[PDB]
């Protein structure tokens, strides 16, 4: 053939959109759309032997990537291809019978790890019903990232097999990115931190919420942005919050939100006074405003007064898109 076609994958947003390149979270899905092109053998006569060698195609994801769930495979036509397909799923090529390795390594074709690949169970008929008509079939594909793969880069490449001849393509790649929080206890905001000193009864303490930073380049929206702290209630008398940002905050309109801004007006706080209970919650129609490509974060201080002796300790806990974290536990005594 002189104008090959060798596969592609994409990796997509939920707007459908490519994300290549960018962060996503903890617990992401990655939808994956990734194509097997045919349109190059439209009209070919190939041999009955070239034939016989089938097609085969691979999908191999780098070790962050956990369960692979098939949305479809279809072909340009429309049709479902699925049931023509034979799965297999291997932890190395070594497990594979020995035909299907000299297949791929005839090819050119040496997947590292673990990977998915469908061959076609009737090559004649797939032949004839889809390559020789230059059908190209779409594999949707979606995958977990796997919890024990906290950072670095997520990665998925496929690679095809023609009548033996193999051709690799793209390798879609997306950071991983943890959320992380901290918690401190100070004076006063922008005061010393007091953390495991001696607070004098009534006097005012700062509990400092250290949001994470929402890093530009992710490959989706925020929705949810929120601490909630539990406060020993019975030692810690809440007095109010203070909420700032952290970054210099863009919105889709281009309208720049400078670091330091107070925050308040796009969230909401509760206080359980009879559990300790306190949340603070960045409103969903605000985070949907901010920029893709703009950082978004912010710090919330929380002040109380110490109206009892002993040991009094806090801890925060942090979500970000359904992501949970923990700050430390801090303390004071009295």
């Known amino acids: 053939v002189l104008f090959q076609g060798p596969p592609t994958k994409k990796v997509l947003d939920e707007n459908g959109q490519s ?98 690949m469908w061959t076609a169970k009737d090559p004649q008929a797939f032949y004839k019903a889809y390559v020789q008509k230059g059908l190209d079939i779409t594999y949707n594909l979606s995958f977990k990232v796997k919890k024990e793969f906290t950072k670095g880069q997520i990665k998925n490449g496929v690679a095809q097999i023609d009548f ?63 601490f909630v702290d539990h406060l020993q209630h019975t030692h810690d008398l809440y007095l109010k919050d203070k909420v700032v940002a952290k970054v210099a905050i863009t919105l889709k309109d281009g309208t720049v939100i400078p670091k330091g801004t107070n925050l308040v007006q796009y969230t909401e706080t509760v206080y359980n006074k009879e559990t300790g209970r306190y949340e603070l919650a960045f409103k969903a129609d605000f985070l949907a405003q901010v920029s893709r490509s703009s950082a978004f974060g912010a710090d919330d201080f929380i002040v109380v007064k110490r109206i009892k002796a002993g040991d009094v300790y806090n801890t925060a806990d942090f979500f970000v898109n359904g992501n949970k974290v923990k700050t430390e536990t801090v303390v004071t005594h009295t």
Do not use: C
Request: charged residues 25%.
């Open 164 to 226: 033996g001849n193999g051709y690799t393509g793209n390798i879609v790649v997306n950071d991983l990115t943890t959320p992380e929080v901290h918690k401190d206890v100070l004076d006063k905001e922008d005061g010393k931190s007091i953390n495991n000193d001696t607070v004098k009864l009534g006097d005012e303490v700062t509990y400092k919420l250290e949001g994470w930073v929402v890093p530009a380049n992710r490959g989706y929206d925020l929705f949810e942005y929120k």
């Open 19 to 116: 994300i290549n390149g960018k962060s996503v979270l903890p617990n992401a899905t990655l939808d994956y759309v990734a194509k097997q092109n045919f349109s190059q053998y439209k009209g070919i006569k190939a041999s009955a032997e070239a034939i016989a060698k089938g097609f085969a195609f691979v999908d191999q994801p780098n070790e962050a990537l956990a369960e692979l769930t098939v949305k479809s495979i279809k072909a340009s036509n429309g049709d479902d291809v699925s049931s023509l397909l034979e799965m297999r799923h291997v932890l190395s090529k070594d497990t594979l019978d020995q035909k299907l390795q000299s297949l791929i390594k005839e090819a050119g074709i040496s997947p590292v790890g673990e990977f998915y």
